Amino acid sequence: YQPTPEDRFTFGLWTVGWQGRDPFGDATRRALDPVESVRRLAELGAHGVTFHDDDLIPFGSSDSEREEHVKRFRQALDDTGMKVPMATTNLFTHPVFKDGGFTANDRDVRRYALRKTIRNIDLAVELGAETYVAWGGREGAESGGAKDVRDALDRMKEAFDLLGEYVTSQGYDIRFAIEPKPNEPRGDILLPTVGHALAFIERLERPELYGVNPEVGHEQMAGLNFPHGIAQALWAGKLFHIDLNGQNGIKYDQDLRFGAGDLRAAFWLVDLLESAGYSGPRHFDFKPPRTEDFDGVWASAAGCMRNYLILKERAAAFRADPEVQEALRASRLDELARPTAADGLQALLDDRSAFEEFDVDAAAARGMAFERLDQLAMDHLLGA
Amino acid sequence: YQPTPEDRFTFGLWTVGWQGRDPFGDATRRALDPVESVRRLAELGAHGVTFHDDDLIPFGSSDSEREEHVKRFRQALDDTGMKVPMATTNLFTHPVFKDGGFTANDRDVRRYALRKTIRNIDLAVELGAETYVAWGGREGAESGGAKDVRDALDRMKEAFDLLGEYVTSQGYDIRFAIEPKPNEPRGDILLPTVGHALAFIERLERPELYGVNPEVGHEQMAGLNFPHGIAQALWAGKLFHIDLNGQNGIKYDQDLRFGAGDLRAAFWLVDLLESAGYSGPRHFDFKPPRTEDFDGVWASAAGCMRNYLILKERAAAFRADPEVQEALRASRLDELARPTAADGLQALLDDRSAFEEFDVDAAAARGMAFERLDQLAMDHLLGA
Amino acid sequence: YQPTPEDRFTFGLWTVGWQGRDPFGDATRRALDPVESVRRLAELGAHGVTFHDDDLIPFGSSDSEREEHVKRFRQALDDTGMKVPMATTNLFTHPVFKDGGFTANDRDVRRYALRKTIRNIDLAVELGAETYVAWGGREGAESGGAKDVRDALDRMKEAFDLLGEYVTSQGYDIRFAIEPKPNEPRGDILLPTVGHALAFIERLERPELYGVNPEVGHEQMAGLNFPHGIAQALWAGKLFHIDLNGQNGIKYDQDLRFGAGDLRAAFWLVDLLESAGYSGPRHFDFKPPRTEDFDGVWASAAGCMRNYLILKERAAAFRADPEVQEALRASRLDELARPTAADGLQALLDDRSAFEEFDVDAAAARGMAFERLDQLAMDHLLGA
Amino acid sequence: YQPTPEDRFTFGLWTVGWQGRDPFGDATRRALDPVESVRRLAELGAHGVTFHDDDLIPFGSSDSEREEHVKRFRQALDDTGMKVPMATTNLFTHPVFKDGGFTANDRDVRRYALRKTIRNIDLAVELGAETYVAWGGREGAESGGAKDVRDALDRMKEAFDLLGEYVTSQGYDIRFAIEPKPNEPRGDILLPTVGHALAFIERLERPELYGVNPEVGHEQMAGLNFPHGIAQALWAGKLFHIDLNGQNGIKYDQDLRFGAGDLRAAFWLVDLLESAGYSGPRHFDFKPPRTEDFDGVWASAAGCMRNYLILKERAAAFRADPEVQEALRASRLDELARPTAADGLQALLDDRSAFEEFDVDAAAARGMAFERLDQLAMDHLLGA
Ligand SMILES: [Mg+2]
Ligand SMILES: [Mg+2]
Ligand SMILES: [Mg+2]
Ligand SMILES: [Mg+2]
Ligand SMILES: [Mg+2]
Ligand SMILES: [Mg+2]
Ligand SMILES: [Mg+2]
Ligand SMILES: [Mg+2]
């Protein structure tokens, strides 16, 4: 289960670089130089790294300092072969964003948020990023009157439309991915789930430029089925990117290493991604727990990739197993993939076997055989 | 706080008619004749009733029995002035639907589900219903392999597209409303939230025919902010109908009377519905707790309407209060409603006050004054 | 992974016998004769069965009918070698219990509840049960004023104290196990978690007669860590019985087969039970999903046992692995088991190395190496 | 609704002093001098303040610096009349506590944790505190193998037993209150609920010295009914202290101002506290949202007290209302308070009206009238 750059595993600078500050505790780890993280991640078999602007260039940096930070980073990329497939903007850490970036009540903040984003889009394109992620972590509210959500969605649409106009005007070959999260750090975050983000995208001026960057743990913070949400994103043609991690149910955003948290959901996710031929980066947005020293950081990052590869093997073995293929037919997964009424509406209406002569009791008595199928899945997951 | 038919309060037959059977207990109340529920609800000030096909016509009824059940119902409507603004299909109670209706793995069940739906659409139109609700309570899964969600969404789209073709072909002036629910009775239900349903609608052949019928408790079963979800539905122009009830957080679907559960969310919901001028029925999908006898049933139904009317008064007083209007300006809700960059992208890019000369620290120091605003909201809610 | 009666796997009659009625659907399976379930479970390798009174003897049965039902059951036990290690009372299905049994507001219902319980205690003892489970599924409330919880706890204590007096007065060698559940079918259930039940037991007149019967899914309905709760029950010496099943997070009580739901929690549970030498029955309180026919029922029941046995193997391999034993030392699990201050309070107070001369920064820099340990656990779970 | 020191409202220094650092953002507010918070809180009508050691004395302070910080604080208390009813230890912020204080795997850390606690107990007693709170926020785990919970409970018991020995040996008139929290900042925290803490206390050497300090939001992070948990704590005689705040369901610990979050739960809490004659401090453990400037901080703190006082008025009006008193009798709350079987076990067994002659159907048909009662409660809450 050794990862290669072929597997397209990517990590955010902020992931292995998380110093371990949480709402109740100081940092337990010193800051990592991005150059060192690139080197270490390349040694582990990562394909690339991702960054917020403020991960790479400290907020408030001069243009010459910005120059220097990028050149050092680019040299590390050249030295390692690491790619930068995705970049994003930090519109959540600085106090100015305390009420949001794109949907801050203050108009001048929203304008600043856009300008900060645009500057990093240019850098992202320069570094070869194909996807630009937007996580509006501060877009939302703790109280009902603070945020008229219709106005805020107007502002959110306006911001994304202007970004789309910007990338079009520049001829950039980059697409946007909206990363939903239901809550934290705001009491409720706008576009809280994959579904809300998908629906929002359809109201943008150029919907083709926008997809979703769902995160395992974020959908699970709403108790939702992450593979189901990913399937809907795939069905819509909008799975531009994905954030992999672990989460133990409905609580604060844990960002455990991938495979931790809901392991069976991870299995079904990998099954779906591989079956659907998802070709984008397998990006880990995780935090090595603050209990860990730097050896634990790299162990946790390695485990992200290891668990993906183990689940990939098990999911492939599951789907390739002739006994499973028979069980899938026994459960009529093949019939699910057949049109209900390719014969059309009138033929359906005239079809007495569909209603007047339909034996509802004989159909009702047919067991779905889902439990045998699921135990085969369990056996495959466990290597049993 | 006396409701009138003007207030458009509607109730499902299955609500006050719930006999109190839950997963662990037998019925505590005898069945209600729909005619009696119409009469009793009219006496309480309801505007109308809604029904599943199987609420009104017992499953398996002959055409003559169906005739008789409808005529008796129509006479009660004529006797009371009650309307039927919405109807829906029971595709969840009968064992034949144990794996779904529209997305059952068995093709013959999916065809039956459509035929059962179409027959009730005709009846709905005959009775004057403007909205036809679809709650796919059995569409989903308990295990990952039982349901290929992409195929299931194909089947769901196919079903809704055929229904849209049917109503168009018939010239019916009826629209569809998809009612999301995250789980229960399936382990996960497809289209689990308002967002997922809104996104799905955009992939239908005639999206204009479809909106959402969100339910308070259902979004709260995912820990989501129901007023936020309603605002997004309104923003999309898709709030065709709404189900009002109460829910105490993330657990089984309680269907408490409206105002029970999350009371402040109910306040903000009423505020939003009234502010946005939502003109559809205020429909209660609730269950009088099985502790109650029939007097408790009507008390609970009356309380649904009473609580809406109290919250409506309090929300109106909140918005009309000049001190609140000043607080809203203090929190810059007015600025939220102003375009971020009506001057356009180039003007934004050339605007040094938006970035180079933006004083981020002075902007960051501005308090949002949300807590004063929210306490005014609290004072208004409590009549303090 | 073939179960034997040695493994002490037990099943409730109501589990494989669940007809599949849920809040939104009719039964999908015919009733099972308890005699057939005993036979079928014995064939699968079960050790025994458990029952509510009303599972075995239909409510309202005459004494001669009761006689006949028990004799038939006893013959099936004799025919199969199956034991009955646990019995319990149905104080939740009949409408009379709609507000509880032991804590119903109506005094006459509480007296009936006790008499119904006592009659089944006699039968339980006759059939050889060692543990008598109490699941107060109806003890609770949907609204705040319906139930004064202090009075209800008084009534609950009174009921359990009288049951303890009864078994003592009769010389019965049976102990009681309180089964907590946070909610469903009541909006909130009294004694909602293992902790609340453990705390309550300490206020009973004869605490030694009472322990807990925690259920995997029930603690997970509160988002709690089930192995942690079991560890506290073991630490208290109160793990008299355990209900094994699966649950996908905070939602309605799914009662999935064991190993489904949170698989890693199942691993850590089995690890703990086996490490602690828990010698009681491994009881499955699960429901074969109503999608299933009877073949699916027995497949699901078999999978309960299979998954326990697989996890048992993996947990044993984990603990036996010298690399894991080294990792446990690296994470200082050995130091956790050493007393903090066996030298006593005064020695601690005089120990300058414990404070004045304690190098907090050197201690803080020590990584816990938990992530390497957890990935070894993952590798062992997955057979990697 | 003006608070007076009579109302015993207390605030932690860390509450109004929270600088607004959250997992995704920097501080939005400058640090508050504790002297200024005491002054400002006294002006608002607070009765007193509480503190962690590290709130009052910066970690690493010299004895002379510690001297100075305490003297300045004591002068502010003398200047304002403010009391310090409760103190606690910060065993969670410093990196040394990353795996816990009392249950850290490292023995030397556990010894340090105790010594740090003992030093602050002395200061607490000097300042007049009656209750010493222990919130073991770092006691727990993110992974199953990191923490043997039985060993950890041994260590937790050992620590609390040594603290009890210490206060006894010193003759201090102070009691301990364990503050449960289910999770955050650890993935799972030991003693996660009021129930677990109550059960744990019963295993301590001197249980009479220990009670619970439940927090509204913490129990609601497990989806539990906070008034129910408080009632059990009162029933056990263990409600030594209480932390009041608001929480919107199962998510990260919001620490909203009291009355925010679940408003009806706040109503029922106040009803219970006032009805039971709880005489301890009404302590607010809340965080003014980081959107706020200092005016918003004091507005939020004032709203804590205001909402308590409004709910107190409404709960008193509810209980004093003769129509409610009649409704309580209609729902048989009076019968709930009567013993089930004061006549004793034998009389119960011989009572044919309790079983053989009990009319279960007539009892079952009696409505509980809970919905009318709850709507009266709603009307009273809303001032309707
Ligand atoms: Mg995350
Ligand atoms: Mg992410
Ligand atoms: Mg519902
Ligand atoms: Mg509904
Ligand atoms: Mg259960
Ligand atoms: Mg159970
Ligand atoms: Mg808190
Ligand atoms: Mg607290």
Closest CA to A94 of D31, B353, D297, D290: D290
A52 forms beta bridges with A88
- Within 10 angstroms of residue C360's Cβ, the number of other Cβ atoms is 18
Would you please indicate which residues of C are annotated as catalytic (active-site) residues?
Answer: 52, 55
State residue D106 phi and psi, 5-degree precision.
Answer: -70, 125
Q: How far is Cα A279 from Cα A269, in angstroms, rounded to an integer?
A: 14
Structure tokens given for B127: 């009775």
Q: How far is the CA of D46 from the centre of ligand 7 (A)?
A: 20
**CB neighbour burial string for D9-36, b if at least 16 within 10 angstroms, e if fewer:** bbbbbbbbbbebbbbbbbebbeebebbe
Q: Annotated catalytic residue: which of A47, A52, A283, A380?
A: A52
Task: Say what the alpha-carbon torsion angle C223, C228, C229, C231 is, to the nearest 10 degrees.
Answer: 170
**B346: CB partners within 8 A, 6+ apart:** none
Q: How far is CA D117 from CA A262, C188, C321, D122, D166, in A?
A: 37, 37, 38, 9, 11
Coil, strand or helix: which one is D196? Answer: helix
Contact predicate A245/A285, CB 8 Å: yes
Q: Which of D188, D116, D50 has the alpha carbon at shortest distance from C363?
A: D116
Q: Name all contacts of C161-165 with Cβ < 8 Å and 24+ positions apart.
A: C161/C204, C161/C205, C161/C206, C162/C114, C162/D340, C162/D341, C162/D345, C162/D348, C163/C114, C163/C117, C163/C118, C163/C121, C163/C132, C164/C204, C164/C205, C164/C206, C164/C209, C164/C210, C165/C205, C165/D345
Beta strands per DSSP E along A115-209: 131-134, 140-141, 175-178, 188-189
Q: Quick check: A298 and A16 in contact, CB under 8 A? A: yes
The answer, yes or no, to whether the previous bond of B180 is cis (omega within 30 of 0) is no
Residues 6+ apart with CB under 8 A from D7: D45, D47, D282, D305, D308, D309
What interhelical angle do B294-320 and B322-330 show, nearest 10? 70
Interface test with C, best of D336, D352, D358, D368 (most C CBs within 10 A): D336
Half-sphere exposure at residue C66, Cβ-oriented, CA atoms within 13 angstroms? 10
Name the pairing type of β-strands B48-52 and B9-12: parallel
Cis peptide before D214 (omega within 30 of 0): no
**Cβ C295–A220 below 8 Å, yes or no?**
no
What letter would DSSP give residue B6?
G
- Residues C88 and C125 sit within 8 Å (Cβ to Cβ): no
DSSP letter string over C119-137?
A: HHHHHHHHTT-SEEEE--T
Provide the Cα torsion C42, C44, C46, C52; round to 10°.
-70
Question: Residue A261 corresponds to which amino acid?
Answer: G
Angle between helices C294-320 and C34-44 (to 10 degrees): 40
According to DSSP, residue D145 is labeled G
The answer to whether the CB of C289 falls within 8 A of the CB of C258 is no
What is the rounded distance in angstroms from the CA atom of residue A314 to the CA atom of residue A22?
35
What is the count of residue pairs from A and C with beta carbons less than 8 Å apart?
A: 142
Instruction: Please report, for chain A, the start and end positions of each structural domain, with discontinuous segments joined by +.
Output: 1-384
In this structure, the number of other CB atoms found within 10 A of the CB of residue D349 comes to 17
What is the DSSP annotation of B95-139? Answer: GGGTT-STT-SSHHHHHHHHHHHHHHHHHHHHTT-SEEEE--TT-
Query: Is the CB of residue B153 less than 8 Å from the CB of residue A231?
Result: yes
Give every CB contact of residue C193 below 8 A, 6+ residues apart in sequence. C180, C182, C218, C219, C222, C224, C229, D193, D195, D196, D222, D224
Question: Which residue stretches of chain D are H helix?
Answer: 13-16, 34-44, 53-56, 63-80, 107-126, 149-170, 194-201, 216-220, 226-235, 263-276, 294-320, 322-330, 333-336, 345-350, 360-365, 370-382
Residues facing A284 on adjacent strands:
A11, A244
Query: Tokens 């932390």, residue?
Result: D243
Q: What are the chain C neighbours of D374 within 8 Å (beta carbons)?
A: 142-146
Helix, strand, coil tally for chain B in percent (to 5):
50, 10, 40
Burial class (CB in 10 A: 0-12, 13-18, 19+), C282: buried
Helix, strand and coil content of chain A, in percent to the nearest 5, comes to 50, 10, 40
User: Chain D contacts of C95, Cβ < 8 Å?
Assistant: 364-365
For residue A246, what are the β-bridge partners? A256
Beta bridge partners of A83: A48
**CB atoms closer than 10 angstroms to residue A13:** 22
Calpha distance A159→A173 (Å, rounded): 19
* Single-letter residue type at A36: E
Token couple for C327: 């990792």
B239 SS3 class: strand
- CA atoms of A305 and A257, how far apart (whole Å): 9
Measured between beta carbons, which residues in chain C are less than 8 angstroms from residue A372? Answer: 295-296, 299
Max CA separation in chain C (angstroms): 79
By C-alpha distance, which of D23, D68, D16, D8 is closest to D38? D16
| CA max distance for chain A | 79
Inter-chain residue contact C23 with B26, CB threshold 8 Å: no
CA dist D61 and D113 (Å) reads 16
| Shortest CA gap D141–chain C (Å) | 9
- The continuous run of DSSP H or E covering C268 comes out as helix C263-276
**DSSP string over A80-129:** HT-EEEEEE---SSSGGGTT-STT-SSHHHHHHHHHHHHHHHHHHHHTT-
Helix (H) or strand (E) holding C198: helix C194-201
User: D341: which chain C residues are within 8 Å (Cβ-Cβ)?
Assistant: 111, 114, 158, 162
Secondary structure class of D9 (helix, strand, coil):
strand
Distance from C-alpha of D342 to C-alpha of B259, rounded to nearest angstrom: 40
Q: List beta partners, residue B188.
A: B141
Specify whether B55 is catalytic: yes
Q: What is the CB-side half-sphere exposure of residue C267 using CA atoms within 13 A?
A: 29
Q: Which ligand neighbours the alpha carbon of B135 most closely?
A: 4
Compute, in angstroms, the gap from residue D122 CA to the centroid of ligand 8: 21
Helix (H) or strand (E) holding D178: strand D175-178
Please tell me whether the peptide bond between C185 and the residue prior to it is cis, using omega within 30 degrees of 0: yes
Q: Among D55, D99, D262, D271, which one carries the catalytic annotation? A: D55
Token pair of C246 as six digits: 């699966």
Closest CA to A300 of A85, A35, A40, A87: A40
- What separation in Å is there between the alpha carbon of B177 and the centre of ligand 5? 33
Let me know: does D234 contact D348? Beta carbons within 8 Å.
no
* Other Cβ atoms closer than 10 A to D363: 18
- Please list every residue in chain B whose beta carbon sits closer than 8 Å to the beta carbon of residue C250: 250-251
- Supply the angle between the helices D294-320 and D34-44 in degrees, to the nearest 10: 40
Strand-pairing partners, residue D51, are: D87
- Give dist(CA C275, CA C268) in Å, integer: 10
| Nearest Cα residue in chain B from D377 | B260
CA D134 to CA C304: how far, in whole Å?
A: 41
Rg (CA), chain B: 23
Query: Which subunits sit against B, judged by 3+ Cβ pairs under 8 A?
Result: A, C, D
Q: How far apart, in whole angstroms, are the C-alpha atoms of residue C106 and residue D331?
A: 9
Q: Which residue has the tokens 């919001």?
A: D254
d(CA B161, CA B157): 6
Contact between chains at A21 and D20 (C-beta distance less than 8 A): no
Q: B294-320 and B34-44 are packed helices; what angle lies between their axes, rounded to 10 degrees?
A: 40
Helix (H, G, I), strand (E, B) or coil at D163: helix
Helix (H, G, I), strand (E, B) or coil at D58: coil
For A330, B381, C50, C114, C258, the CA distances from A361, given in Å and listed in that order, are 19, 52, 32, 42, 30
Nearest CA in chain B to D305: B375
Confirm whether A55 is a catalytic residue.
yes
Q: Which residues contact D104 (CB under 8 A, 6 or more apart)?
A: D97, D110, D113, D138
Q: Is the dihedral of CA D119, D123, D128, D133 positive or negative?
A: negative
- Residue A291 C-beta-side C-alpha neighbours within 13 Å: 31
Task: Give CATH for domain B1-384.
Answer: 3.20.20.150
Q: What are phi and psi of D87, to 5 degrees?
A: -140, 165
- φ, ψ for residue B275 (rounded to 5)? -65, -40
The DSSP element (H or E) to which A211 belongs, if any, is strand A210-212
What is the helix (H) or strand (E) element at residue D284, kind and residue range? Answer: strand D282-284
> What is the rounded CA–CA span in Å between residue B50 and residue B283?
8
Rounded Cα gap, residues C251 and C248, in angstroms: 8
Rounded Cα distance between A153 and D380, Å, is 37
Alpha carbon of C189: minimum distance to chain A alpha carbons (Å): 20
- CB-neighbour burial class of residue D338 (10 A; exposed 0-12, middle 13-18, buried 19+): middle
Q: Alpha-carbon torsion A61, A67, A73, A76, what sign?
A: negative
Q: What is the DSSP letter of D208?
A: G
Q: How far is D64 from chain A (nearest CA, A)?
A: 25
Nearest C-alpha of chain C: how many angstroms from A295? 8
